[PDB]
Amino acid sequence: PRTEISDKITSELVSKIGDKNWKIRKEGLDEVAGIINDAKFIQPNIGELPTALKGRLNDSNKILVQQTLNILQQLAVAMGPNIKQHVKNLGIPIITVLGDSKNNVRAAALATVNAWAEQTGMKEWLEGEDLSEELKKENPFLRQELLGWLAEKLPTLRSTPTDLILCVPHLYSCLEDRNGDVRKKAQDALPFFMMHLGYEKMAKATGKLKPTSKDQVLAMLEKAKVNM
């Protein structure tokens, strides 16, 4: 079977990963990468590792954010579909890294959520309020990347996205975002939202907008109704 590595996740190791000295944090993360690669395939119980890694997704040293993202990629491949058990606790915090100002860090975060989605499908990622609460944030890097990801994943869903409607008010915010790339990605995503929600549901959601915003969004909606 797969190897259980929970007993490798010791108090000593978790303590190193959270140390105040980056060299000791790095030593801890280096060890974790080695443990997973040597096991190759692992059981889903990874002790307190998720708490330790969540704590490094905003490390002051960007190389340790990158190292943590690579370890999260290892975990998806090594654990397989059982990594679904960790999506809400550990996967969603990866989404916040799409808001990094460093292009190479954002790129690694996107690759990481895609590596997980290959194992888990998109259902857990789109369920409930968690993703919409990230899209809500006025970070143009986060909005851009998340809208791009939605446009790519929405036509491939194996389960109806129950809570896609929760993203809609923030999608509409993005249609008028200050950032032009955000506006472009929101426009790209619009028809893929509509394929699941339908026009009337999306048109109803414009009620909460100010009259000027409501007017432009409805016009964008009419045009996407061509592709229906």
CB neighbour class for 226 (10 Å; exposed up to 12, middle 13-18, buried from 19): exposed
Q: Answer yes or no: CATH 1.25.10.10 is held by domain 1-228.
A: yes
Cβ 59 vs Cβ 21: under 8 Å: no
Cβ 85 vs Cβ 120: under 8 Å: no
* Separation between Cα atoms, residue 10 and residue 140, nearest integer Å: 39
* Separation between Cα atoms, residue 126 and residue 47, nearest integer Å: 26
Task: Give the alpha-carbon dihedral of 163, 71, 42, 76, to 10 degrees.
Answer: 30
* Separation between Cα atoms, residue 95 and residue 129, nearest integer Å: 13
Residue position matching structure tokens 């026009």: 199
Q: Using the Cα atoms of residue 120, residue 123, residue 128 and residue 132 in order, give the sign of their dihedral.
A: positive
Domains of the chain by residue range: 1-228
Q: Which long-range contacts (CB under 8 A, 24 or more apart) does 176-179 make?
A: 176/213, 176/216, 177/140, 177/143, 178/140, 179/140, 179/143, 179/144
Of the candidates 57, 87, 71, which has an alpha carbon nearest to the alpha carbon of residue 5?
71
* Separation between Cα atoms, residue 28 and residue 184, nearest integer Å: 41
Q: How was this structure determined?
A: X-ray
Resolution in angstroms for this experimental structure?
A: 1.9
HSE, side-chain direction, 13 A CA sphere, residue 43: 11
* Separation between Cα atoms, residue 56 and residue 78, nearest integer Å: 20
Angle at 175 between CA 204 and CA 194, to 5 degrees: 45
* Separation between Cα atoms, residue 89 and residue 91, nearest integer Å: 6
